[PDB]
Design an enzyme around this catalytic site. Structure first.
Site, short mmCIF file in Angstrom:
data_model
loop_
_atom_site.label_atom_id
_atom_site.label_comp_id
_atom_site.label_asym_id
_atom_site.label_seq_id
_atom_site.Cartn_x
_atom_site.Cartn_y
_atom_site.Cartn_z
N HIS A 296 0.78 -1.24 0.00
CA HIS A 296 0.00 0.00 0.00
C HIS A 296 0.82 1.30 0.00
O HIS A 296 0.25 2.38 0.09
CB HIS A 296 -0.94 0.03 1.22
CG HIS A 296 -1.89 -1.12 1.29
ND1 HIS A 296 -3.09 -1.14 0.61
CD2 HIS A 296 -1.82 -2.29 1.96
CE1 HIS A 296 -3.72 -2.27 0.86
NE2 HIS A 296 -2.97 -2.99 1.68
N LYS B 292 -8.95 13.59 4.05
CA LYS B 292 -7.99 12.49 4.07
C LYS B 292 -7.10 12.73 5.28
O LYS B 292 -7.05 13.85 5.80
CB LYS B 292 -7.13 12.47 2.79
CG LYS B 292 -6.47 13.81 2.43
CD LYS B 292 -5.73 13.76 1.08
CE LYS B 292 -6.68 13.78 -0.12
NZ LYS B 292 -6.80 12.44 -0.76
N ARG B 293 -6.41 11.68 5.73
CA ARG B 293 -5.48 11.82 6.86
C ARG B 293 -4.46 12.92 6.60
O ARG B 293 -4.04 13.12 5.46
CB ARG B 293 -4.77 10.49 7.14
CG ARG B 293 -5.66 9.41 7.76
CD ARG B 293 -6.18 9.83 9.13
NE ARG B 293 -5.08 9.96 10.09
CZ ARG B 293 -4.69 9.00 10.92
NH1 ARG B 293 -5.32 7.82 10.94
NH2 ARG B 293 -3.68 9.22 11.75
N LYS C 184 0.57 14.07 1.24
CA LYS C 184 -0.76 14.38 0.71
C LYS C 184 -0.91 15.89 0.44
O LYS C 184 -1.85 16.32 -0.25
CB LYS C 184 -1.85 13.88 1.66
CG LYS C 184 -1.96 12.37 1.75
CD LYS C 184 -2.91 11.95 2.87
CE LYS C 184 -3.13 10.44 2.92
NZ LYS C 184 -3.87 9.96 1.71
N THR D 241 -8.46 6.28 -2.51
CA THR D 241 -9.82 5.75 -2.71
C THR D 241 -10.84 6.86 -2.52
O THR D 241 -11.95 6.79 -3.05
CB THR D 241 -10.16 4.60 -1.75
OG1 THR D 241 -9.80 4.96 -0.42
CG2 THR D 241 -9.44 3.31 -2.16
N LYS E 202 -14.43 8.00 -4.52
CA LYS E 202 -15.67 8.40 -3.85
C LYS E 202 -16.19 9.72 -4.41
O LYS E 202 -17.38 9.85 -4.69
CB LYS E 202 -15.47 8.50 -2.34
CG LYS E 202 -14.98 7.22 -1.66
CD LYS E 202 -14.57 7.48 -0.22
CE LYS E 202 -13.79 6.31 0.36
NZ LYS E 202 -13.30 6.65 1.75
O1 LIG Z 1 -4.73 0.55 -0.79
C1 LIG Z 1 -5.56 1.27 0.11
C2 LIG Z 1 -4.89 2.58 0.52
O2 LIG Z 1 -3.85 2.28 1.44
C3 LIG Z 1 -3.15 3.39 1.97
O3 LIG Z 1 -4.02 4.19 2.76
C4 LIG Z 1 -2.53 4.23 0.85
O4 LIG Z 1 -1.90 5.37 1.39
C5 LIG Z 1 -3.58 4.62 -0.20
O5 LIG Z 1 -2.96 5.26 -1.30
C6 LIG Z 1 -4.36 3.38 -0.68
O6 LIG Z 1 -5.44 3.78 -1.50
#
Ligand SMILES: OC[C@H]1O[C@H](O)[C@H](O)[C@@H](O)[C@@H]1O
Ligand SMILES: OC[C@H]1O[C@H](O)[C@H](O)[C@@H](O)[C@@H]1O
EC number: 2.4.1.1
Lengths: 808, 808
Positions: free
Chosen positions: B350, B541-542, B547, B649, B653
């Site tokens: 990830h 987002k976090r 980011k 993701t 959305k």
């Molecule tokens: O794979 C699921 C998610 O994992 C982590 O949060 C990553 O930072 C993100 O980019 C990805 O979409």
């Protein structure tokens, strides 16, 4: 089984409904199919089904109290020794036969299912069990009564016997959930600790405190077939809402308050955590009391609408807490607030042993509850002013009566606090209440004689007869109907049957049935075999020096030694059973347990003895085990040193269940003998007067050793390592205490005890006469119903009239 | 409201039944009357009622898998970011309209009731939410799939904004209970820690361990209207069965394992407690897997019956644990056990950020899991032997590929462990999976090219369209029917409506409705007023440097400064919303939050600006808030430095919910633009190639400062204390990082970002064309359904064929 009429009707629609709801719960609640379902799943399906029957009555009862607005009784206790709930619920709702039939039709044995339930073992012994019987009786007597305590995550430790020693394990009673309670997180309240006092514009303010939340869990308390369902509210500690990870973990510290029951019976240990528990219950509870008072229709009417009963001094902080609330928060003047407090509060004392009484160091109270200490001091000053006015110039009386105990560590005497802050103080048996007025609280009795009362203890005939001994309940009902179940004095009618051949037969038949069942329990659960054709000699109660399990040990060895001296001489076969928990830090009590097992190691394996004598230690004695063993008992051992057992209640359980009693003239033993006639009790040993005479001249154990060859033999067996060959000196501490430091005079009652026991065996040899004396015991046990006790509390202390009248 | 056809039918008998069961639960479950019942009570009455509808299907589904014996998919994750459950359950069971009608008839607003439910916030961000979408899609695709994780007592901390700073509070999500889960204490399993290894007669033995019990809690996972209900099993830490008081309290230590979610997003912290959590899930889970395998009909068939998917390296210990079980307990030879393990396990990566990757010190593993370290070493030796054989004499490759990282502290590279022990390794977007094969895992790709896959992420169109945006779901269904809800590629049919006047109207109408609703939420919950006639510019987002919320900050200040320079010049009004949590120990992230609020303190109170520009920080961003804000968004901020966001993701959305995207060519942004056409995306900034070029010559932030007067102005505003007048030097750390230590090249994308944002405003001035571009976005979002993703996992990795076929 299902033919027992006291168990109610198995209505065809009712059986149909129960089976349907059993199946509904198995599916929707347990999420289980008949293919994967275990006996435990089936227990829970039944528990939920039965619990559903409490709900309508539970809601209506509490609505009834809102509408009628009767005076409310708050029973504050650190202990509620409830036991199991499934059978009790079925009994009180008349559902037992119906559930028995429903489960049978489903292909299940309900009694096997009942064994799955964990005890709510939230008590140590008599005091905790009294609270439980009281809850039952107060509901049966239609009182608007509210039990208030702590929901311990872990109750009284589970006892394991390993290598003959007690081992303690956590009593994880909530492992599989609790289907009876209803969590009430919405009614969570803040409890404050530490901080400091600001005296300002309005007056005192308690500030900078640490908050612990109190989450209530409510449990239904059904009365006997009167449609009354009262509430036991137990508080659970919760961390307040508002590095990072450690901070989250440290929530455990506040939550530890409700983690575990302090396993001390008749012994005060001054741990801060215990003090926190005590205040936790008091603070949260009194918030409920005040709020409910306000939503009932100015604090002049408070004692007309509120009674607070203090079970021992454990919730004694209710006195300064009520004062704190009324003065600091409600802004009443001190004098009026104190008038209210005394009229509201009453205190029940459960012992005279100095080490069992609560004396909290002032420093601990100053740190943890600074405002409460301030209020305690002011209570003390004004109380002592009253003493000074009533007894001018009596300076020692002032010192003796002070709430503040002077010394190396300055302490608050919580009993003194309770007497000062209560309109009523009661002991728990006639002899005990008298001893309180004569010695321990003499000065307080002289200041306020009206304050001092007696309320002889009782036990509920529901749990302690109908539930645990349905066979006996049935043969009684066959003769006198069912009214006695909540009117136990009707048992006196059974005296008409002392010469009744059918009843004599049936009383003996029932006892034998219970003995076979208990033998079967021991074989099933422990692979322990007991002689069914032996006298069941039972001492079950917490392990204490004052209760003198050691005196029982001496007699057991006497029987062993007499057999060995004259093996050809016939003796009544006995199974001597002793059970009970020792407090983890109580070294002597732990040694006493090891002695019992060590005695068994010799006796139970001597081929000359065989099945003529066996000594067994009943593991994990608790409410559910009491329900099993007591109905199976022939002889009840109640052998405390005269003046030490405040009342006892186990004694009452045995009397009601067809055992004869061997006992000293102590606690309620005296009134039991009075009720039955002394001729029907095996009374022995020093009276209180005799104990005092020994104290006056000094107790010398050596004298008894020197004069009694049979005692000498036993002490020498203990010292030389006859009962511990691999560790000869194992029992040196027991021997040393007995010889040199015995506060409870074991040797002084040895000869009379042994002689009295001979008379027990002599009567047992005559089955007809044994049974006839048993009938005379059961028939006169009526006084010892907790209904009688509670009715007395209601009329003589709380100012409410009990009623067995059914709700619609 | 009730007129929405995608919400199902309100059958008259169904509405009747729901009302009856609502009332039944209020009475029997909640023990409440309509007189005392709160909205919370009503939520729970509804929750239990709705939950009952899952049970039949839940039992039948699991019975179906037993009978059919399909290959079982085990999805191991330390995070399941589930959100709320009530609406999701109603949606998937077609009960929403019926429950809406039932509650209406009872005089209740179901949407008010829905707001009472706590999020199951058992995740940090994207990775945790991916697991949740995956569970949903796997059930909808009829896979015998089992989510396995930890039941954290406390999920992601609740964020409070106080004085403009983030404050953390415990997320007490279980305070009022969880009506969805079923506790399974009967299926509790032992997990072992510490101890030592004995190599003996049979082989290795793990002995002298400390036991922690794992109690499973099972939660239903409903597929979309296919009668499939799968299971999420979450383990809870429990002290094992067997002075005293302290010993009971110390049970908390073992139980702390499942206490709290580690609040780190894209950052590895090597805490032992976290390692314990990781092994806790792995050990308990693999016991279930083995037992279920054995009860299905020798370990040669294991990978035909078992798939283990590793969500990140967090459950990587499954590899040595499976080896440990097969070799030590099942007594298979190493080689066969390893064949089984690799064929069973697959690993999903990830991120590429080095600090986000798990590297555990060998000493920690040696102490906590000595047998696992031994197995890891042996895995490493044999793996490196394979490398040596494939690449003879390539010694640096051996060093690079080793599971063991050398240095001051010797560490195990968990990603290396995963690649070695898995038959498949996947990244989460095309660009990311390519970067893995090119750089990070290049050596591993060269050894085993077949191993490396791509699985572009997805989101569930149930939660993320039908549930959160029913208005949009409805206007779509009005044109193309309901099939798209589990066949999202059908959204391409909407391209036929780019010139449809009615659809253009309705798309815009729905967006406006969502914006009014979100404005109403902010006013109701926070008394915050936002301009409804402003562009909703949203970055949720976090909070992370990669980011680049900081780049957003720079643009916001640019808008402010431009207004101040030319107040008469018209600008598209904006409400700039930024929300997200910073990890408690992430200082820079915490400073960034304070900057956002500080910017607002100036901008939102400048009378020259008024409602033309407002900057707000959305407090406590979580799944339920995402469901509220995303449907209300006009502009989606996806502005990570190219090469840093693995997929994203949140981007998906926004696209699905009718926002246009401003973003870099990063993660799945690239494929989103590809699907929609780049002309329909606001793409700006450095590509990965450009970032690498800057790295090659060295990033000099000063150059951009020197060349861009508008940037210079902002940095000087920050440094001089324009946004912190009471503490001028407040943002010195932000300024210093930007100027001298910026790994993410904020300044390098400033000019392109500002220009791209101008183009956003230019299009927004044309409502018709804004909406037409929106239609082109929604219509091409189909690829980004998690159904598509899961189908790929199923066919390309797990070796199972998905099926949307309904169960009876
Ligand atoms: O794979 C699921 C998610 O994992 C982590 O949060 C990553 O930072 C993100 O980019 C990805 O979409
Ligand atoms: O009052 C209830 C009980 O409290 C304590 O356990 C006393 O030791 C006991 O004698 C009494 O019966």
């Amino acid at each position: 089984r299902k033919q027992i009429s006291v168990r109610g009707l198995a209505g065809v629609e009712n059986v149909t409904e129960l089976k349907k709801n059993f199946n509904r719960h198995l599916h929707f609640t347990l999420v289980k199919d008949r293919n994967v379902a275990t006996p435990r799943d089936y227990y829970f399906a039944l528990a939920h089904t039965v619990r559903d029957h409490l709900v309508g009555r539970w809601i209506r009862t509490q609505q009834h109290y809102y509408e009628k607005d009767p005076k409310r009784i708050y029973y504050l206790s650190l202990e509620f020794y409830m036991g199991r709930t499934l059978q009790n619920t079925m009994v009180n709702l008349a559902l037992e036969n119906a559930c028995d039939e429903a489960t049978y039709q489903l292909g299940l044995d309900m009694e096997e299912l009942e064994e799955i339930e964990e005890d709510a073992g939230l008590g140590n012994g008599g005091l905790g069990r009294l609270a439980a019987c009281f809850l039952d009786s107060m509901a049966t007597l239609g009182l608007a009564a509210y039990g208030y305590g702590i929901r311990y995550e872990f109750g009284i430790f589970n006892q394991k016997i390993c290598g003959g020693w007690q081992m303690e394990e956590a009593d994880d009673w909530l492992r599989y959930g609790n289907p009876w309670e209803k969590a009430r997180p919405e009614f969570t309240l803040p409890v404050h600790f530490y901080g400091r006092v600001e005296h300002t514009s309005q007056g005192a303010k308690w500030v900078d405190t640490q908050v612990v939340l109190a989450m209530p869990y409510d449990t239904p308390v059904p009365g006997y077939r009167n449609n009354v369902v009262n509430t036991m509210r137990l508080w659970s500690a919760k961390a307040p809402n508002d590095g990072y990870i450690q901070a989250v973990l440290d929530r455990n510290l506040a939550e530890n308050i409700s983690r575990v029951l302090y396993p001390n019976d008749n012994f005060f240990e001054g741990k801060e955590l215990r003090l926190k528990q005590e205040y936790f219950v008091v603070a949260a509870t009194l918030q409920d009391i005040i709020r409910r008072f306000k939503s009932s229709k100015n604090f002049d009417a408070f004692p007309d609408k509120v009674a607070i009963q203090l079970n021992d001094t454990h919730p004694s902080l209710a006195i300064p807490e009520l004062m704190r609330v009324l003065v600091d928060l409600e802004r009443l003047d001190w004098d009026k607030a104190w008038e209210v407090t005394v009229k509201t509060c009453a205190y029940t004392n459960h012992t005279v042993l100095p080490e069992a009484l609560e004396r909290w160091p002032v420093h601990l109270l100053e740190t943890l509850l600074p405002r409460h200490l301030q209020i305690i001091y002011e209570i003390n000053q004004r109380f002592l002013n009253r003493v000074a006015a009533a007894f001018p110039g009596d300076v020692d009386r002032l010192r003796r009566m002070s709430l503040v105990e002077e010394g190396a560590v300055k302490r608050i005497n919580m009993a003194h606090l309770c007497i000062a802050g209560s309109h009523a103080v009661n002991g728990v048996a006639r002899i005990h209440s008298e001893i309180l007025k004569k010695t321990i609280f003499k000065d307080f009795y002289e200041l306020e004689p009206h304050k001092f009362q007696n309320k002889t203890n009782g036990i509920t005939p529901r749990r302690w007869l109908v539930l645990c001994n349905p066979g006996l309940a049935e043969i009684i009902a066959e003769r006198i109907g069912e009214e006695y179940i909540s009117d136990l004095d009707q048992l006196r009618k059974l005296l008409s049957y002392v010469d009744d051949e059918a009843f004599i037969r049936d009383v003996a038949k029932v006892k034998q049935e219970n003995k076979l069942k208990f033998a079967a329990y021991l074989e099933r659960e422990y692979k322990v075999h007991i002689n069914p054709n032996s006298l069941f000699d039972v001492q079950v109660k917490r392990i204490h020096e004052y209760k003198r399990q050691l005196l029982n040990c001496l007699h057991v060895i006497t029987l062993y030694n007499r057999i060995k001296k004259e093996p050809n001489k016939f003796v009544v076969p006995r199974t001597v059973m002793i059970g009970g928990k020792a407090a983890p830090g109580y070294h002597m009590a732990k040694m006493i347990i090891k002695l019992i097992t060590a005695i068994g190691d010799v006796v139970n394996h001597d081929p000359v003895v065989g099945d003529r004598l066996r000594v067994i230690f009943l593991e994990n004695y608790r409410v559910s085990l009491a329900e099993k063993v007591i109905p199976a008992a022939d002889l009840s051992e109640q052998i405390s040193t005269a003046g030490t057992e405040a009342s006892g209640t186990g004694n009452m359980k045995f009397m009601l269940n067809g055992a004869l009693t061997i006992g000293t003239m102590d606690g309620a033993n005296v009134e039991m003998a009075e009720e039955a006639g002394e001729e029907n009790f095996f009374i022995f040993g020093m009276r209180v007067e005799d104990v005092d005479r020994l104290d006056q001249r000094g107790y010398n154990a050596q004298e008894y050793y020197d004069r009694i060859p049979e005692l000498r033999q036993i002490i020498e067996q203990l010292s030389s390592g006859f009962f511990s060959p691999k560790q000869p000196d194992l029992f040196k501490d027991i021997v040393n205490m007995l010889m040199h430091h015995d506060r409870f005079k074991v040797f002084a009652d040895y000869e009379e005890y042994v002689k009295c026991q001979e008379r027990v065996s002599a009567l047992y040899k005559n089955p007809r006469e044994w049974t006839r004396m048993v009938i005379r015991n059961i028939a006169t046990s009526g006084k010892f119903s907790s209904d009688r006790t509670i009715a007395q509390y209601a009329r003589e202390i709380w100012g409410v009239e009990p009623s067995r009248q059914r709700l619609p």
